[PDB]
Design a protein around this ligand. Structure first.
Ligand SMILES: Cc1ccncc1NC(=O)Cn1ccc2ccc(F)cc21
Ligand SMILES: Cc1ccncc1NC(=O)Cn1ccc2ccc(F)cc21
Lengths: 304, 304
């Protein structure tokens, strides 16, 4: 029993973190096989960020300008290329600590763990969700760029995020491991306001099922609703519309607890309309939306 | 910017996790040097837990009865001893992945990371605090026993907790790495109710300073208070009394933000008396108490 915001064990990712320096800029790189992945803005000075021409800036850079250090040892750079907003630095040595890995581009609402790093060294690990507006609410300071987000299935690490920037509103934007930004963000220091941060309805329901499994049941009521009726409430409270696909993904949780998805939607509807009345659910005084239905099943079953 | 419940990178601890089986019971062990540490209740059957005589149960066990597996390879057990509520299994091979380590017995209010494991395999990592009643609010299922709590200072892992049991109330009890339980708990299946779970006042103040650093300032008011006046409020709301030692530990946060500790106590006092009025602080709708002043400084400065 108990339910926590749990991150994947970070060891497999720690063995991939390196430090990349270009000129006076130092950030984090991800070393997998004989390639180091890092944000392309490593080639910029703070002044360049206002309007950088990355292709032009990269012409003045040679292999010997990218200083790649793994712990206390220096990697030899034998090639460099830009793929979208990431640089790929070919090194002469395959990372001996390279785990089984994949590069995946996640969908909004999906969760992942972040290993925050500075100077190629890990500082901490926490669980995040890709918000519906494609930002992440992380914890990053200057130097954290190149820190990565990932999920783990048994022995395979699926890398989904690489940190690039902080928006003026304190939220975070970044790319997948192919260098494509999530959302409309660009790696430029300009007005990039975020869209509406809606609540991930399917995750709140999954977390409500997690609460029932762990003993927190005060919010269960005598009511039911329909998808269309629930969605009228969800729209009013800036919640994502719930679809039949979401109901289907909640099936195993519905089966385990014996509480039909639409009955749980009616509990959520009353919680939205009436609030928590000074009460808590799984130690939270608000509706948590950064646990997917898969996360709840995983934590509640003990998948390693 | 941003503030998250961050755990230490778990890699150094992942390399120490092993599976220990005795008879029909399997739990986690911690392999450091040529010794495997595990909860002594590994020698019990579920029936034995009602009133176990560990010394008598251990007489029927020989070195060959403790099956210790590290990944897919078997460790040879050349000695066994019981130290308080932990068993120390001497193996013939030093763990090559043994990090620099210490065993520390933490004080209530202190925080630590937990690497939850099942069958010697890690499932996840999360940040915890030793509650003032000596329980921990974790996330553990059957098989998680032997999972450990730790802190990391640069390259040294300080092991502070080993998981032993779940109380009937869903909270968790365990020992330090010398086998001594935190609090009055015993490794017996009996009525062991927990004392008052008070709020760690010094941590709430540290988190309020973290909020100011990250932009959340609505709770700052025009008032001040005294230690004795604040403590009258703290007693009413089951908060730990604030001492001059706590004020002293909050000094660096007070210095960074320019907000005197007693002024922050007056903000906390008004938050206790009036509530949050439907507002949030660092994404929480309640006063968070599982960040120490050291945690706040560490996260806000980027210590790796
Ligand atoms: C300081 C900080 C805190 C947290 N996370 C990241 C950062 N760093 C940055 O944002 C660096 N940086 C500055 C301007 C700019 C423009 C575009 C871009 F891709 C990166 C940019
Ligand atoms: C099932 C579970 C869930 C979460 N964390 C731990 C557990 N396991 C246990 O508590 C095992 N166990 C059962 C009786 C008993 C008595 C004393 C003791 F030290 C261990 C005991």
């Amino acid at each position: 029993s108990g339910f926590r915001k749990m991150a994947f064990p970070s060891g497999k990712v720690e063995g991939c973190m390196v430090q990349v320096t270009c000129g006076t800029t130092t950030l984090n790189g991800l070393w997998l096989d004989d390639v180091v992945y890092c944000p392309r803005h490593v080639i910029c000075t703070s002044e360049d960020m206002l309007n950088p021409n990355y292709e032009d800036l990269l012409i003045r850079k040679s292999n010997h300008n990218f200083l790649v250090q793994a712990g206390n040892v220096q990697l030899r750079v034998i090639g460099h290329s830009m793929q979208n907003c990431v640089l790929k630095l070919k090194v002469d040595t395959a990372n001996p600590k390279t785990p089984k890995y994949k590069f995946v581009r996640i969908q909004p609402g999906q969760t992942f763990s972040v290993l925050a790093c500075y100077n190629g060294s890990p500082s901490g690990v926490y669980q995040c969700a890709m918000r519906p507006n494609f930002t992440i609410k992380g914890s990053f300071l200057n130097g954290s760029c190149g820190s990565v987000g990932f999920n783990i299935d048994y022995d395979c690490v699926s890398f989904c995020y690489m940190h690039h920037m902080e928006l003026p509103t304190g939220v975070h934007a970044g790319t997948d491991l192919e260098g494509n930004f999530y959302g409309p963000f660009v790696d430029r220091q300009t007005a990039q306001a975020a869209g509406t941060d809606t609540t991930i309805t399917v995750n709140v329901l999954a977390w409500l099922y997690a609460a029932v499994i762990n003993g927190d049941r005060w919010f269960l009521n005598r009511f039911t609703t329909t998808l269309n009726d629930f969605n009228l409430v969800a729209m009013k409270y800036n919640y994502e519309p719930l679809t039949q696909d979401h109901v289907d993904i909640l099936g195993p949780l519905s089966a385990q607890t014996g509480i039909a998805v639409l009955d749980m939607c009616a509990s959520l509807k009353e919680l939205l309309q009436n609030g928590m009345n000074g009460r808590t659910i799984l130690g939270s005084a608000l509706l948590e939306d950064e646990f997917t239905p898969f996360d709840v099943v995983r934590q509640c079953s003990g998948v390693t």
